Amino acid sequence: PTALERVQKEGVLRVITRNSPATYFQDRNGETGFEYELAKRFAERLGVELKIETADNLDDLYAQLSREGGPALAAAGLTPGAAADASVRYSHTYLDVTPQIIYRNGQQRPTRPEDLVGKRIMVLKGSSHAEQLAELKKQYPELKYEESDAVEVVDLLRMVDVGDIDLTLVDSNELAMNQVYFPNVRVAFDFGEARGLAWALPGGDDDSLMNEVNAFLDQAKKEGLLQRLKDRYYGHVDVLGYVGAYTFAQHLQQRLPRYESHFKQSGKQLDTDWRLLAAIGYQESLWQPGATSKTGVRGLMMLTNRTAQAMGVSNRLDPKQSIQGGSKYFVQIRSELPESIKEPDRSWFALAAYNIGGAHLEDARKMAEKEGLNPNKWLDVKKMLPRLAQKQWYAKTRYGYARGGETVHFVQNVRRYYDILTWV
Ligand SMILES: CC(C)C[C@H](N)C(=O)O
Ligand SMILES: [Cl-]
Structure with missing residues (x-):
């Protein structure tokens, strides 16, 4: 066999x-x-x-x-x-x-192999990373590093973040994955290709x-x-931008604990994942209860006065009440979508009407139908949204021009923060 x-x-x-x-x-x-x-x-x-x-x-x-x-x-x-x-x-x-040496921002910056001398360094026992260090230990007999059988990559990065260790060696992909949790962690240099x-x-x-x-x-x-x-x-760093990635990590630790409880209580009955709800929160105001813009929206979930009125929000600037109105409003929209749209695609169409509105979302759906695509499939209608900003295309819709690209960004980002909070 x-x-x-x-x-x-x-x-x-x-x-x-x-x-x-x-x-x-x-x-x-x-x-x-x-x-x-x-x-x-x-x-x-x-x-x-x-x-x-x-x-x-x-x-x-x-x-x-x-x-x-x-x-x-x-x-x-x-x-x-x-x-x-x-x-x-x-x-x-x-x-x-690329394996990369990792350090804490603002601490002494290693730039060459020599610099790894006389540092508290941890790595996973049995890793390729462990092995790249032994090899350098031949070149540099004064090199010390700890090989640990108990910890994972996430633990090594935490340690550098808060200073229980100076440095680690990790592959760049998982570094970027992890950059959204550890705001102080940085790439000292590339230790290879x-x-x-x-x-x-x-x-x-x-x-x-x-x-x-x-x-x-x-x-x-x-x-x-x-x-x-x-x-x-x-692709967090690649997609959100370096600055977006680490600040998100700052906000996860400094802002989210203040609201998480409210995010969770709204989730409970609405049978809506609280983490999805917080992700809307994060994209809308980076978890800033007091935020206002110049365009008609205030608060944690960026509500209009008319939505706040209809959801029974007294104070758009109160975190709990903003979350409640904004969470109730996502579920009202989710619920108004045609019966033909199925989970999980349903939730993603709801994110999009949340940014662009029902009328405009309907037009991109209609647009997907005319192009032979499925208007009940999100990957299909997401290809149409951008087109709502294109002459040849909006001039054929009932409701004309709309920032469809902003809307595609809005759902991708919320879906990514959703992943992030799921991955804590
Ligand atoms: C650090 C390890 C979990 C991963 C590394 N690429 C290895 O194969 O050893
Ligand atoms: Cl998407």
């Missing part, structure tokens, strides 16, 4: 991974993870049900591959081994990340499944799948 036959006959792809939202994570709206979503599509490619396990550190993640009847593979942001170990093989690389992540399979000369893993990854590159997962999980 080949490695490939066995999975096909067992009806199940056994995959091992780390506990982390980079890799695999369990929440209310189901499971998520770069690696999970990817290995999930691989089990789908083969006709099989995926089953996820977790190791407690990386020596034990690699161990399980040697166990009898253990995991088919490890999908875990692993980057291949620089030396020779017969007990493990690696797929083609599926993502270019964009070596790639690969999945690990037990050692051997059987390739039945390895060729398929490699065929799947080459297909995934062909269709943009890795690029899309990269943006969802690892």
